[PDB]
Coordinates of C-alpha atoms in Angstrom, one line a residue:
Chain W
X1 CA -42.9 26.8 -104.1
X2 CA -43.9 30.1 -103.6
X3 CA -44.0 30.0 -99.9
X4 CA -41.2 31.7 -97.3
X5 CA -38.4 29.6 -96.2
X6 CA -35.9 30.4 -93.7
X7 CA -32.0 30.6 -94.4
X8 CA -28.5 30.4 -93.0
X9 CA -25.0 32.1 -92.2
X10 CA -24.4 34.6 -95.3
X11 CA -21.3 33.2 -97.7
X12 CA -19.4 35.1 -100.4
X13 CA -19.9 34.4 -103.7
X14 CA -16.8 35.0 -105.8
X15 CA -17.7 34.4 -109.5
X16 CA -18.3 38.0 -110.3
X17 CA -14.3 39.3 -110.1
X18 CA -14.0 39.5 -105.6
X19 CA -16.3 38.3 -103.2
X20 CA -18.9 41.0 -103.6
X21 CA -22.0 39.2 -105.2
X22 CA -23.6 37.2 -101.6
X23 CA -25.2 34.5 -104.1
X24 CA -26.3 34.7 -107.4
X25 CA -30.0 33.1 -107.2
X26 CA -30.1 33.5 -110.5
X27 CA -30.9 29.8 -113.2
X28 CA -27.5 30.2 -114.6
X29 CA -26.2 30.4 -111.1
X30 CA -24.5 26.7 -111.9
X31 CA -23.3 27.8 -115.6
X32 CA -21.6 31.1 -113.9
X33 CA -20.0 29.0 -111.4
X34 CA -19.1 26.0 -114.1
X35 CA -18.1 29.3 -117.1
X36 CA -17.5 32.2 -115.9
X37 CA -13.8 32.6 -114.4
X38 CA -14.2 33.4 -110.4
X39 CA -11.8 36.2 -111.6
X40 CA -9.4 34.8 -108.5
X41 CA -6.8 37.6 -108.6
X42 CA -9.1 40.3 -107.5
X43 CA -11.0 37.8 -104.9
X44 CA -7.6 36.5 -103.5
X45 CA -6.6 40.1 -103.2
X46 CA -9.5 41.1 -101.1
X47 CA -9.2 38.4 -99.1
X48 CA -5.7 38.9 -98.1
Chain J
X1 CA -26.1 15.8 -54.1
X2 CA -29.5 14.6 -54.3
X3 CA -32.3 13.4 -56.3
X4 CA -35.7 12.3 -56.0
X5 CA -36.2 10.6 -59.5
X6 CA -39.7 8.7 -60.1
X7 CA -40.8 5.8 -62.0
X8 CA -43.8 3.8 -62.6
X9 CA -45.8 6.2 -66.1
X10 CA -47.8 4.2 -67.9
X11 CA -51.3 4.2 -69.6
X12 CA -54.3 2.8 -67.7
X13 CA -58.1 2.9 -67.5
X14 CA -60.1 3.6 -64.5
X15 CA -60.5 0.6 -61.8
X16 CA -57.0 -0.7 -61.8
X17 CA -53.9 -0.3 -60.3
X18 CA -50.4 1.3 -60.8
X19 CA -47.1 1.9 -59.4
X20 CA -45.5 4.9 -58.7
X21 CA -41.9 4.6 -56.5
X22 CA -39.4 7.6 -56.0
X23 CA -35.7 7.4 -55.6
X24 CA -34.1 8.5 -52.8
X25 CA -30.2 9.0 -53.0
X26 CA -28.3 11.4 -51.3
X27 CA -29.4 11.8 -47.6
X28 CA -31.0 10.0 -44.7
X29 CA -34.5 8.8 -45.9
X30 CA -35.6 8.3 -42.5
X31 CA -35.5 12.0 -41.5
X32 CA -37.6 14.1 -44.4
X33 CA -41.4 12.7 -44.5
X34 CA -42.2 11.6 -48.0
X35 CA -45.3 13.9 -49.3
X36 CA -47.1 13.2 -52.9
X37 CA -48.7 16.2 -55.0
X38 CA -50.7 15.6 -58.4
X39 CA -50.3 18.3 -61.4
X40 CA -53.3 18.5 -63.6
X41 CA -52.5 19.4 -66.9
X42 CA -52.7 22.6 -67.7
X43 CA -53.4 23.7 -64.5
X44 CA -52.1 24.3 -60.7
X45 CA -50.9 21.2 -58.8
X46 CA -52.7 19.7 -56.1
X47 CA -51.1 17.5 -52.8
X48 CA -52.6 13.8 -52.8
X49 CA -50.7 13.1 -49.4
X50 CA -47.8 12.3 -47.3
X51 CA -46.2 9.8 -44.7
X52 CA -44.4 10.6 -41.5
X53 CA -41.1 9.6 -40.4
X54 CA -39.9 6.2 -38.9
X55 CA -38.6 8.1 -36.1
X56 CA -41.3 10.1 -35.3
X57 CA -43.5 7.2 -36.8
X58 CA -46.8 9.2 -36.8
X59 CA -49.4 8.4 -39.5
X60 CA -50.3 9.2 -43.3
X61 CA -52.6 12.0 -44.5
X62 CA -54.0 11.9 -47.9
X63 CA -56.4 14.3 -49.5
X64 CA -60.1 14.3 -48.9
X65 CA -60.4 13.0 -52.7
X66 CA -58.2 10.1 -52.1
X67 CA -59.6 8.6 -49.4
X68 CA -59.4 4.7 -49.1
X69 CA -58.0 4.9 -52.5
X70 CA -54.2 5.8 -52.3
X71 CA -51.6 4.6 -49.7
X72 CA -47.9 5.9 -48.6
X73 CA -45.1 3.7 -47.4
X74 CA -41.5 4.1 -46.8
X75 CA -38.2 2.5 -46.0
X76 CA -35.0 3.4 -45.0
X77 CA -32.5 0.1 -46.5
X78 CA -34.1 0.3 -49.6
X79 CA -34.7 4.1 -49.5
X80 CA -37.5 4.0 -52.5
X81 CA -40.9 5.8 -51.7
X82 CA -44.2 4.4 -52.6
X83 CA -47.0 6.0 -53.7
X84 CA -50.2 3.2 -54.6
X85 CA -53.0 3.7 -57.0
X86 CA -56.2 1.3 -57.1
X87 CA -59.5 2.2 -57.9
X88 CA -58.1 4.5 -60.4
X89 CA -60.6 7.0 -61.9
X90 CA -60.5 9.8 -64.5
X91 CA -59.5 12.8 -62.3
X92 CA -56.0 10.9 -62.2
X93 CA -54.7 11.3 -65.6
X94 CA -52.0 13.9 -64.7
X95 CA -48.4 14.3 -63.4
X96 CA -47.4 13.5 -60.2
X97 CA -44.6 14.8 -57.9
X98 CA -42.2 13.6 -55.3
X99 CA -41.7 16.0 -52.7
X100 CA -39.2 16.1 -49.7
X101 CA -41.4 17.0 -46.7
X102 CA -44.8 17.2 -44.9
X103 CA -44.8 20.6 -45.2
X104 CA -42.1 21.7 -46.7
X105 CA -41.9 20.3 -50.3
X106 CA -38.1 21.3 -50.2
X107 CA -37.9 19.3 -53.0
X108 CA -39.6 18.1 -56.3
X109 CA -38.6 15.5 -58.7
X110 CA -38.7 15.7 -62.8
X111 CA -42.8 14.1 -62.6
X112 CA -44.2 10.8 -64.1
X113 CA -46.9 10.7 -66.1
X114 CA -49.8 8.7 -64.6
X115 CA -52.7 8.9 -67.5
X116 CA -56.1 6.9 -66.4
X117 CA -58.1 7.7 -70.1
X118 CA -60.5 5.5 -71.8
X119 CA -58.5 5.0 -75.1
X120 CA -56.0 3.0 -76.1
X121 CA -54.0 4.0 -78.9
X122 CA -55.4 4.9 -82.2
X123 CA -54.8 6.4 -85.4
X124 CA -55.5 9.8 -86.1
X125 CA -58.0 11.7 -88.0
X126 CA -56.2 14.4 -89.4
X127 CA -58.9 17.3 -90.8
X128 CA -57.2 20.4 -92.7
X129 CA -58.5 24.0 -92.4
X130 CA -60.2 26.1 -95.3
X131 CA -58.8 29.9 -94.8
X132 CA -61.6 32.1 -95.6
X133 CA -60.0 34.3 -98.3
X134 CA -54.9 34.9 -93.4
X135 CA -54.2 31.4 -92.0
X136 CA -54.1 27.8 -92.6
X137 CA -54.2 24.7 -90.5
X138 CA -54.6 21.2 -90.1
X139 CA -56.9 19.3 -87.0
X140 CA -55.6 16.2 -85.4
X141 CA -58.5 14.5 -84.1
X142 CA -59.0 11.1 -82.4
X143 CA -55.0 10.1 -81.8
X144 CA -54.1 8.5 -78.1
X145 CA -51.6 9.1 -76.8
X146 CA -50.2 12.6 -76.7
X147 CA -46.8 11.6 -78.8
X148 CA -47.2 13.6 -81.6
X149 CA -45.3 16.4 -83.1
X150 CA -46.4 18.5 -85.8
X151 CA -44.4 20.5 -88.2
X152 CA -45.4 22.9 -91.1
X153 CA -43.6 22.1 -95.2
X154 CA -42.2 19.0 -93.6
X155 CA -40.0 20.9 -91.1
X156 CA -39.6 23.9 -93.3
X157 CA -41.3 26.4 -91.8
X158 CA -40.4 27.6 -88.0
X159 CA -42.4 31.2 -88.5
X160 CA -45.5 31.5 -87.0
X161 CA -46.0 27.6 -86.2
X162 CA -48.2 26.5 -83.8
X163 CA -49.2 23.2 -82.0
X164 CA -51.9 23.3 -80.2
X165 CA -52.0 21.5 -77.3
X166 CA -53.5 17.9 -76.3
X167 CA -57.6 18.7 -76.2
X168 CA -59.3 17.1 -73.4
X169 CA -62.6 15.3 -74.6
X170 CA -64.6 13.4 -73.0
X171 CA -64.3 10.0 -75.3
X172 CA -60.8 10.0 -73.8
X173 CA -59.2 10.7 -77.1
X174 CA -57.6 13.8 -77.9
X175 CA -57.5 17.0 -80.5
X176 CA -54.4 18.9 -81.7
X177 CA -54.6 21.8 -84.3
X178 CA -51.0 23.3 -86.0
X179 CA -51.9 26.5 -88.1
X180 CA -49.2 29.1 -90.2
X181 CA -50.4 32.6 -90.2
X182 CA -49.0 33.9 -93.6
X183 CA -50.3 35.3 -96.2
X184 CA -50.3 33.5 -99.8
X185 CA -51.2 25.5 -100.4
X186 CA -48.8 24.2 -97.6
X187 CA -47.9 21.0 -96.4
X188 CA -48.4 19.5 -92.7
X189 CA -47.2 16.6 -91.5
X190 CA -48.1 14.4 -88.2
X191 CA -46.1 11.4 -87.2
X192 CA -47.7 9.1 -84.5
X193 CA -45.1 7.6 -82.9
X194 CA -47.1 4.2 -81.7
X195 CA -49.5 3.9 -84.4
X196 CA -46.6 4.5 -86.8
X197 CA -49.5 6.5 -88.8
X198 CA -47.8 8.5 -91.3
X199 CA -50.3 11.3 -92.3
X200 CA -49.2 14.0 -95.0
X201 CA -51.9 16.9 -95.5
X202 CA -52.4 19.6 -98.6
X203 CA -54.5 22.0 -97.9
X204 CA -56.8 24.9 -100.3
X205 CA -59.5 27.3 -99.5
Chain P
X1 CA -31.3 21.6 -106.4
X2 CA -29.3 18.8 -105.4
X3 CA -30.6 16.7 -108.3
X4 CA -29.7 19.7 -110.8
X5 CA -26.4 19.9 -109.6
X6 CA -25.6 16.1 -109.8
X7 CA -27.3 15.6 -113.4
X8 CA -25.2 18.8 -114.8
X9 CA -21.7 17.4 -113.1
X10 CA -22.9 13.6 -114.4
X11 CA -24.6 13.8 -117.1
X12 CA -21.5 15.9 -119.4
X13 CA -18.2 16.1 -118.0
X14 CA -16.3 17.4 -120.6
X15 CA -12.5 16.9 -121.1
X16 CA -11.6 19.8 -118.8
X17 CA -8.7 19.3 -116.9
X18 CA -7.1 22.1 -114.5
X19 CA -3.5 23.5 -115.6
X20 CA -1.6 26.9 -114.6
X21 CA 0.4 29.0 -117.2
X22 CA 2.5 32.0 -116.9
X23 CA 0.5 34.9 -118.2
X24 CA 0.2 38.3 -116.7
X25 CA -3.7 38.7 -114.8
X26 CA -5.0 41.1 -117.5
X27 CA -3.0 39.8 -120.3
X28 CA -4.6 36.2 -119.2
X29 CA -8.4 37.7 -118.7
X30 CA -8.4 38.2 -122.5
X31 CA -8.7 34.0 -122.7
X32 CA -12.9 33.8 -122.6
X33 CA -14.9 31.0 -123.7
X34 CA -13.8 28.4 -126.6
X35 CA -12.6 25.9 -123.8
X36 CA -9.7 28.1 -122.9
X37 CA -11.1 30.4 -120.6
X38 CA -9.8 31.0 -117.5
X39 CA -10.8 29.1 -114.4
X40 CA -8.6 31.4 -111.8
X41 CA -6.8 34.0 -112.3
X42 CA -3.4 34.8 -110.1
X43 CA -1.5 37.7 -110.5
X44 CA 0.9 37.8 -113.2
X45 CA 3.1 34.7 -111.8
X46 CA 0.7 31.8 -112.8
X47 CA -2.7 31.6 -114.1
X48 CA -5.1 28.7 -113.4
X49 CA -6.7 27.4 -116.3
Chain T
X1 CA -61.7 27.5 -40.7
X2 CA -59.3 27.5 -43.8
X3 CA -57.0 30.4 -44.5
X4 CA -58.1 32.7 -47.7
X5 CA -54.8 32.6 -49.5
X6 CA -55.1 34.8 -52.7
X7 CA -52.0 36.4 -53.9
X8 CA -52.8 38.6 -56.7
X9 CA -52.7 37.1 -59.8
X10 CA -51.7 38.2 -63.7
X11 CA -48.2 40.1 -63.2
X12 CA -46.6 40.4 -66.0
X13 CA -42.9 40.5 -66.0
X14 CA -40.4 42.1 -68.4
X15 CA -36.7 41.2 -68.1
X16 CA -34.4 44.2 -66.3
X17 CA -37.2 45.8 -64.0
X18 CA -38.4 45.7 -60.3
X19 CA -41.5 44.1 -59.9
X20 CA -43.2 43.0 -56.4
X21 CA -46.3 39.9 -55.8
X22 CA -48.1 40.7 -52.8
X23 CA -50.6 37.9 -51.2
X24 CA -53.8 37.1 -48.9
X25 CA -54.4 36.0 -45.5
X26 CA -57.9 35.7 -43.8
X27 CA -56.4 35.6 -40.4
X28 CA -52.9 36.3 -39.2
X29 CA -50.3 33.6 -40.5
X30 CA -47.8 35.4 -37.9
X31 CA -47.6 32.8 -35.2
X32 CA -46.1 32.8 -31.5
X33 CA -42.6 32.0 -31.9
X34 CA -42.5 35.4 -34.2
X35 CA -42.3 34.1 -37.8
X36 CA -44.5 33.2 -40.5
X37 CA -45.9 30.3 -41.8
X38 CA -45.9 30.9 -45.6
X39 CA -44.1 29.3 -48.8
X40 CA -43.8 31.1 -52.1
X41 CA -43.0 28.3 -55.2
X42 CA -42.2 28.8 -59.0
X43 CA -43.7 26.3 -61.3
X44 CA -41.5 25.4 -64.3
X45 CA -43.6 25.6 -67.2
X46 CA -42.4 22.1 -68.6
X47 CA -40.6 20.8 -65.6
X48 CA -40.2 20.7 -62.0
X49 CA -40.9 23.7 -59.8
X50 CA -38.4 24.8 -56.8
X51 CA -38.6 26.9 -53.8
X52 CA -38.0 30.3 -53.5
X53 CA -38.8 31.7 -49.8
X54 CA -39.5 30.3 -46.8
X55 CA -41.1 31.5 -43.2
X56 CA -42.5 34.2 -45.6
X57 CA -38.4 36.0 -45.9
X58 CA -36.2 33.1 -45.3
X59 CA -34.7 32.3 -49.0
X60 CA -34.0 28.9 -49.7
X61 CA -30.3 27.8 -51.2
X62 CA -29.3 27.2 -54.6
X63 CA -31.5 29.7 -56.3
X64 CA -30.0 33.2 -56.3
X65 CA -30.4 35.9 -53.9
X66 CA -33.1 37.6 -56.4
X67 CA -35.9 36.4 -54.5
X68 CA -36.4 38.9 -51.8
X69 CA -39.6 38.7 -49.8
X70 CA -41.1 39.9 -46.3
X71 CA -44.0 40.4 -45.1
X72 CA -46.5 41.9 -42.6
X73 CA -48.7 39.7 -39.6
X74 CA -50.9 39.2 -42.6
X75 CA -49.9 41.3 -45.6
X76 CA -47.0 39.2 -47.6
X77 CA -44.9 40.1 -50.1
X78 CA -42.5 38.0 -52.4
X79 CA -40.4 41.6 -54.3
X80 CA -38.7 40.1 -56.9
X81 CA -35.7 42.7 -57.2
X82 CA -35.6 42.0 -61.1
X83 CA -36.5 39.0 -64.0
X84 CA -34.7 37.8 -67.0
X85 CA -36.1 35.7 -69.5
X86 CA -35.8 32.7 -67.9
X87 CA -38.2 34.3 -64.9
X88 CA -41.1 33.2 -66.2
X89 CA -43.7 30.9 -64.9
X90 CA -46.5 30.3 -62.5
X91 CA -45.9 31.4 -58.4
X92 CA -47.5 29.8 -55.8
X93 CA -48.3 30.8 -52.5
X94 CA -48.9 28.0 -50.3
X95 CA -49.3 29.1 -47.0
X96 CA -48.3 26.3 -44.4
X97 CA -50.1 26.8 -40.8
X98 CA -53.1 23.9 -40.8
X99 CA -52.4 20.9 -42.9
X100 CA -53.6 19.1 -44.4
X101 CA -51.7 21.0 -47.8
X102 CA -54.2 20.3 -50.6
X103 CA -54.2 23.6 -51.9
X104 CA -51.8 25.7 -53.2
X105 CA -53.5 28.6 -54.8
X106 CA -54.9 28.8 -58.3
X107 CA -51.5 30.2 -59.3
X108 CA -49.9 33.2 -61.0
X109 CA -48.8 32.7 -64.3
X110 CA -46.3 35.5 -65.0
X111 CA -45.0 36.1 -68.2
X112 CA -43.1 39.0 -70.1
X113 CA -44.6 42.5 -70.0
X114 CA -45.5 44.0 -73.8
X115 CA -47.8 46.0 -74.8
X116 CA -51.5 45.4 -76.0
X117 CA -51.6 43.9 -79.4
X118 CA -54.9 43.7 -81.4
X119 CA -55.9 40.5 -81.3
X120 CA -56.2 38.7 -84.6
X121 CA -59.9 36.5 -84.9
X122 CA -59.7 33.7 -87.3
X123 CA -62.7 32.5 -88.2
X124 CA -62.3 28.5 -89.9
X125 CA -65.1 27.1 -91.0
X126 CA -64.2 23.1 -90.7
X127 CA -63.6 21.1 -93.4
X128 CA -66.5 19.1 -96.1
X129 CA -64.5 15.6 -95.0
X130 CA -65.3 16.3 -91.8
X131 CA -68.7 16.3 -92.3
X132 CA -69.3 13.4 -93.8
X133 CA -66.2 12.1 -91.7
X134 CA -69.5 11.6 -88.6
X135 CA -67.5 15.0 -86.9
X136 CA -67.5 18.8 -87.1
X137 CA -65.1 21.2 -85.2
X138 CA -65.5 25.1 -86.1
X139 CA -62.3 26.8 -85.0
X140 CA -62.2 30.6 -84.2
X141 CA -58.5 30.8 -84.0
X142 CA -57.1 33.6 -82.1
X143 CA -53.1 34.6 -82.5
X144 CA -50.7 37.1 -81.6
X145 CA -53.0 38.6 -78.3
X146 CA -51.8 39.6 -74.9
X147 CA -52.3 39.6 -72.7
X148 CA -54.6 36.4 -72.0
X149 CA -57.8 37.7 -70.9
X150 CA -60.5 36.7 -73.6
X151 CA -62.9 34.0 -74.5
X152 CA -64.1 32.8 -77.6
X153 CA -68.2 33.1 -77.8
X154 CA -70.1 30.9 -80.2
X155 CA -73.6 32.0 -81.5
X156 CA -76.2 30.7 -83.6
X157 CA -75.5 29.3 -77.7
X158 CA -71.7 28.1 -76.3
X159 CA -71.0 25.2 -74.5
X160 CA -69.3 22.8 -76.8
X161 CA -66.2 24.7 -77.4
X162 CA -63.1 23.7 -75.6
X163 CA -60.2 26.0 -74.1
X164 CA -56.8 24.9 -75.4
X165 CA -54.0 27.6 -74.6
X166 CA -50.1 27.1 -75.0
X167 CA -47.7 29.3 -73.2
X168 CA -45.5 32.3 -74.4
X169 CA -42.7 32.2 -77.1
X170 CA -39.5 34.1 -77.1
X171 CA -39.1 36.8 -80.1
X172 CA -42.6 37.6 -80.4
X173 CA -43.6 37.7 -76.6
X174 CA -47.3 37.1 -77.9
X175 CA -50.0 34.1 -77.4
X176 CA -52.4 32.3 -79.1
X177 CA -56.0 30.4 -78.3
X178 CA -57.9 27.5 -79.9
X179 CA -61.7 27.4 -79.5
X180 CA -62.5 23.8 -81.1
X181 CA -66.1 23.7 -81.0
X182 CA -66.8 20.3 -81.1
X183 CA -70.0 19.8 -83.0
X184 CA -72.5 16.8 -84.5
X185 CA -74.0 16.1 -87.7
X186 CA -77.9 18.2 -88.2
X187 CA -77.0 21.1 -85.9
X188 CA -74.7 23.0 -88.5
X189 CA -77.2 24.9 -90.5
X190 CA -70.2 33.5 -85.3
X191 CA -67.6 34.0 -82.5
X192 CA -66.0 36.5 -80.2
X193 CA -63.5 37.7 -78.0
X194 CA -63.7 39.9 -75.7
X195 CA -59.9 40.5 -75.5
X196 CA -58.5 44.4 -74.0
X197 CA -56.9 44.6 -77.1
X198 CA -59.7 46.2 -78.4
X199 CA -63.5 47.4 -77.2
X200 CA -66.2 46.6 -79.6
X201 CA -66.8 43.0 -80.1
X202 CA -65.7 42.1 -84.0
X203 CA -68.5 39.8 -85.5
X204 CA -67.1 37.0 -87.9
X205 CA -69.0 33.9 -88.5
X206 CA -68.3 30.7 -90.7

């Protein structure tokens, strides 16, 4: 609905090579998550 | 530590009677004077009376409004204070207090509510608001008792929210109004806990 | 959203399974698509995919 | 006769600075034995209230040494060294030289100091259900206005409409009034404040 909502505590959404992208609110949110590689190396490597 | 914890809420109507006893834990009963003070809603409190220690033994005061109407007793194995209703009348339906003293009211407990109202309970007539081009809302009329609680998008929305308070008419029943002011269709919900009357609301200009 | 999420995981699967090979990061970031793309790349020990 | 006890009422209170509640006496409250005869309470907006001073200086235990008050014979003052956000509520002071104790004052509601806000007049026509429902309640809503010192006038005069206030939030520091003007079925073929926020009276009918 086109009304406000509230939200949470901020996560890190990795799918885009590190943890850079918040959250993708995007409608191929899922199909990024389910296809495109979370690009681990360079997200593992940030986190460390 | 000590506590002076009441009991005895309930819902009347006018020309009966009701009990009202307060817990006393804690201390010597026999030495603090047991005094009575009623809280209108919404408004300041007001002392309905008191009884005077065993060892002093004295008498009971109670306020010009309560005369012949409301009596104070005490005891010490027991240690529960009594405060008696009959000939209950509308200017009763509000909160009353323990306190620990004639005139010092040292201490209050948490408060009972003693309603006297002409209703029983009812369903609700829940009445939506029309914004004129802003905010939108949503009456609950006619519901007895208070338990309500109102929430905007089923519980969604938290910004802005309002329920209004219970409204005070004279049929005994009361009014409650929950309104969003934001800018733009929105859903409000009202759950009457004894009625079990589920209402769901959409609202337009 | 939570319906959307359970019909895309329930209603096609697939036959994906999750295995690691020993491909260098870069050299294993060329695999895209054609049910051989990566799932996580690791460094140039072992790959997940 | 009785005592005239009238502390003044309305002070505001914003957390981290020194504030000071003064109070009436018609005759001296300062008796004999050299001490005074006065109580100063907190109501707990939701709960139970609790003492703060005694023989108009002596502090009471338990609550913290924040309530500071003396007095003259018959000039009294409770001066609260500070607030917090929790130090809000309505005082009392019950003066306690001729029982019997009926009253305790009208009662000053404090809240949190801010400055004026406009206040925002809503005017809500009620709804067609209604009317043909046997009811009709015409709401001019007021939100977001402090502080609380305006009523809701109702031309074409008042009489039926109700006064329904709820008490102060916590982020916004603002408040909010319903005027449900309960009305019948052939007498519905404009409201007002009169708030400080601002001077001229803004006209908006249903």
């Amino acid at each position: 609905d086109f009304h406000p909502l509230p939200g949470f505590v901020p996560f890190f959404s990795t799918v885009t090579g590190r943890w850079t992208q918040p959250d993708e609110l995007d409608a191929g949110y899922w199909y990024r998550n389910l296809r495109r590689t979370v690009r681990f190396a360079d997200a593992v490597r940030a986190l460390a | 530590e000590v506590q002076l914890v009441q009991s005895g809420g309930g819902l009347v109507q006018p020309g009966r009677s009701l009990r009202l006893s307060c817990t006393a834990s804690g201390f010597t009963f026999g030495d603090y004077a047991m005094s009575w003070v009623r809280q209108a809603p919404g408004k300041g409190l007001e002392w309905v009376g008191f009884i005077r220690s065993k060892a002093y033994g004295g008498t009971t005061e109670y306020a010009a409004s309560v005369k012949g109407r409301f009596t104070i007793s005490r005891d010490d194995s027991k240690s529960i204070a009594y405060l008696q209703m009959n000939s209950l009348k509308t200017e009763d339906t509000a909160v009353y207090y323990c306190t620990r003293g004639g005139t010092l009211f040292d201490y209050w407990g948490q408060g009972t509510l003693v309603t006297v109202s002409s209703a029983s309970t009812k369903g609700p007539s829940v009445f939506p608001l029309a914004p004129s081009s802003a905010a939108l809302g949503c009456l609950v009329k006619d519901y007895f008792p208070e338990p309500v609680t109102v929430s905007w998008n089923s519980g969604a929305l938290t910004s802005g929210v309002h329920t209004f308070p219970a409204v005070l008419q004279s049929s005994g029943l009361y009014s409650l109004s929950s309104v969003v002011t934001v800018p733009s269709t929105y859903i409000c919900n009202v759950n009457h806990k004894p009625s079990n009357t589920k209402v769901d609301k959409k609202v337009e200009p | 959203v939570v319906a959307l999420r359970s019909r895309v995981i329930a209603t096609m699967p697939g036959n994906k399974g999750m295995a690691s090979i020993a491909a260098p990061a870069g050299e294993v970031r060329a695999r895209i698509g054609d049910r051989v793309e990566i799932a996580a790349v690791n460094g140039p020990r072992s790959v997940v995919v | 006769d009785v005592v005239m006890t009238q502390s003044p009422l309305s002070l505001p209170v914003t957390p981290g600075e020194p504030a000071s509640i003064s109070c009436r006496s018609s005759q001296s409250l300062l008796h004999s034995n050299g001490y005074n005869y006065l109580d100063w309470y907190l109501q707990k907006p939701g709960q139970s209230p609790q003492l703060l001073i005694y023989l108009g200086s002596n502090r009471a235990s338990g609550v913290p040494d924040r309530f500071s008050g003396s007095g003259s014979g018959t000039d009294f003052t409770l001066k609260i060294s500070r607030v917090e956000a929790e130090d809000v509520g309505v005082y009392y002071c019950m003066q306690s030289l001729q029982t019997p104790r009926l009253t305790f004052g009208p009662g000053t509601k404090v809240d949190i100091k801010r400055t004026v806000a406009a206040p925002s007049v809503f005017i809500f026509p009620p709804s067609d259900e209604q009317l043909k429902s046997g009811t009709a309640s015409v709401v001019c809503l007021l939100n977001n206005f402090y502080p609380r010192g305006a009523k809701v006038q109702w031309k074409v005069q008042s009489g039926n409409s109700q006064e329904s206030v709820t008490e102060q939030d916590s982020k916004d520091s603002t408040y909010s009034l319903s005027s449900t003007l309960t009305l019948s079925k052939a007498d519905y073929e404009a409201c007002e404040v009169t708030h400080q926020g601002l001077s001229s009276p803004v006209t908006k009918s249903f």
